[PDB]
């Protein structure tokens, strides 16, 4: 008779372990020690910007904010499209030739 | 003719001399198949 392929198995999304912990480079007992003048050798990011790059810094910040909004919108539309589609995706489901 | 009724998995016929032979009741090839008095093999064009 005709060749009818077997149905695909149903998948389950919740597979595998999930972890949500807090990472600290040093134990909390270290934080109790007061800082000395040697601990300030590495400058903070606040002081790393000079007067010649302030306008550039502001322009990059605004551009990055715009890009974040754009990427959030694209993520929303992509997840909506994904939830619209069904499991047996016709555009990429391989089937025997007639 | 590639998509035959049997599906793309099957391309060449799976039959042989043992099948549909009255003198041999087995389903596998054996010397009794050659012992059949109604079987003969030929070579054609030296390549068939």
Curated annotation (Swiss-Prot), chain A:
Oligomer status and interactors: Component of the heterodimeric RalGAP1 complex with RALGAPA1 and of the heterodimeric RalGAP2 complex with RALGAPA2. Heterodimerization is required for activity.
Tissue: Highly expressed in brain, mostly in amygdala.
Record's protein name: Ral GTPase-activating protein subunit beta
Highest taxon above the source species: Eukaryota
Source species: Homo sapiens
Gene: RALGAPB
Function per UniProt: Non-catalytic subunit of the heterodimeric RalGAP1 and RalGAP2 complexes which act as GTPase activators for the Ras-like small GTPases RALA and RALB.
From Swiss-Prot, chain B:
Signal sequence residues: none
Top-rank taxon: Eukaryota
UniProt subcellular location: Cytoplasm
Subunit structure: Component of the heterodimeric RalGAP2 complex with RALGAPB. Heterodimerization is required for activity.
Protein task: Catalytic subunit of the heterodimeric RalGAP2 complex which acts as a GTPase activator for the Ras-like small GTPases RALA and RALB.
Name of this chain's protein: Ral GTPase-activating protein subunit alpha-2
Biological source species: Homo sapiens
Gene behind the chain: RALGAPA2
Residue span relative to the full protein: 1388 to 1435 of 1873
